[PDB]
């Protein structure tokens, strides 16, 4: 993806967010950070992964933007300069959205292979059995040397 | 000391208005009078932020068009809250009262002359209240 | 008895003001009159802490600059809360009303003369309220 | 990293915090603290580690800035100098952000190797098994001398 | 550290605290107290320890400064001397900060060796085993004399 | 310590308490109380102990000063003698401070040997084992005489 498409895509995904709420320079800053770490030009397979992380970081910057200003710590207002009176009572709204977004990554890109390896059962596949068995660093139960080593007990996991 | 009122509001909209200072001068060379042919000198400026509101009652002297033996004359007034300092006239001097341009009931724009200014010297915050009366139509006041 | 009001406030800012006492004296040696050539003697002092506020309405007699047949005269007034005792004039004596110096609508500073003083003898706390009127421009009052 | 980029990077990460809220001097003070403890000039492998601690320390100084002033202990205000009336009601917001930031270090630098060694199981690796076994200071169960020492029981962990 | 640096360092750590809130004389009073007890001139290894305790004592003096005055026991105010009305409703803020500070001593000096000996397991080190074994005052299970002493039971912990 | 330093030291420790809140006479009264019970002139080892009790006693007298007056039982006030209106709402604050001070004696004097003997295990020291054994008043399990005394059972704890 080029530098101009990312701002176009992020703004649409964030419900048409405006420039003052989030500048185009900040989006490039997070976009560039994941470009150098994932060398997207070298391997184009990380386009969905780099795109998903970029949006999440932008939401994080939005939350901290409410902080460091007076918006986060106020929950009341009252103006009265005569006959005009106004009283109203997004920091908390951005919170659960970030939690919700991390649970539905398909909203960004459906090809993220999300939710595929929840349950793992060991010893029910030949591919997984031999990979563990043939690992030279593996130490299993058949290596119990006891008091002092004896040649009756194997020193390697793999079968001869 | 006051803190909240020492800063600009963030709920009620405020607007800026234009103003102009006023002096006077004598022109006649031989007339023995201080008046002479009086002239007024102007120097424009603006108010930082202001709020305009109309008179609250319906008293006969506060109505807009008034019936006189000559014809349906014109009258307008306002109450203004502002953070700029405006001055009235001072005696034994050549300074006149400041004026500021605001919309009227006839759809046009006319000059209003400051008549009453309220200040709170012991509080510190620069917030003022003014009371204004529209200049007579066809003249520049006095 | 009152406790809280018997101590100085700690939320609303207060300021000190300057004042001056006033007497009078006869100067003419041969004139048979008590007036003679009247003179006033002053002795300055200050008020411990005070609060100044302007008139609340917009009545024609409370406006600052007034149109008279001579020219746009000047007028000002205030309401003051203070913890110092100030006195009005007393008859059959040579004492006049105290005055105190405050800012005006024209940007300068002028003397205001005490006209009404309010006291609560049965309460005990020394808190007073005064009503002041600016001295005519170009004179020292009466 | 040089002395000027740290301020530029910190402000962007903190959502464009202003100069009056945190001076550039204070940022250098915490930046210099970790430079001498991690000799960044000698070993540049600690650039992410020094950067992470610097940002966290700045947030800590921000929290204590709300304390030691009137901002922390007040929760109401009311102004009236005539017809103008105002009533409104960051110490609490900066608290949870520090807790959140301590749980998401990837927001600062993805190369921090966060969350990699949660679960440890012993005796399932040859590298770890021999490290403990060959340790001259190790004392294991086969050394139980009893009432008085006997030459039938080893005095060293490693096998001969 | 000299007498002038400590005030400079403490004020920065406390978020730029002012002179009226805490005088420079009180800081010296607590600084001097830990100087004579830890003879910093004799052993410069206690610079972090004396510095950490000095700041904690200052926070303690700040808490007791709110006490012994009207600030601690009031939670409302109302002034009305005409058209001016003011109403607002650090003793409790200094409380949890002292609790928080005692849990993060690295904020003062990272070289305090904090959080190093939480879990202790006995009998798994030769250094710890022989120190207890060779202690002349130690009394272990192999000394159970029973009814009356017999020469079949050792009277010293160390092996011959 | 002399009669003048005690007031100077107490006031600093109590955060600069004023004279009207606690008179110098009352400080001497509690100071003199512990001087005669600990004969400080005869043994100067109790200077920290006498100082600690003096400060605690002063806090106790401060708490009872709020009681026996109107300050303790009131929790509202309202004044109005015209346009001036005031409404505000240390007995409760002095309570927890006494509890806190009783738990942190190091704030007064670090040499008080606080918190050193929490956990006691018996029979693991030769010094303590022989102290109980050689005590002529000790009565242990080996003295069970039964129905009537017999010369086969010891009447003294110490071994012959």
TrEMBL record, chains A, D, E, F:
InterPro entries registered for this protein in UniProt: PhiTE_adapter-like
Protein name (record): Uncharacterized protein
Provenance organism: Pectobacterium phage phiTE
TrEMBL record, chains B, C:
Listed InterPro entries: Phage_SPP1_head-tail_adaptor
Pfam families per record: Phage_HCP
Protein name: Uncharacterized protein
Annotated source species: Pectobacterium phage phiTE
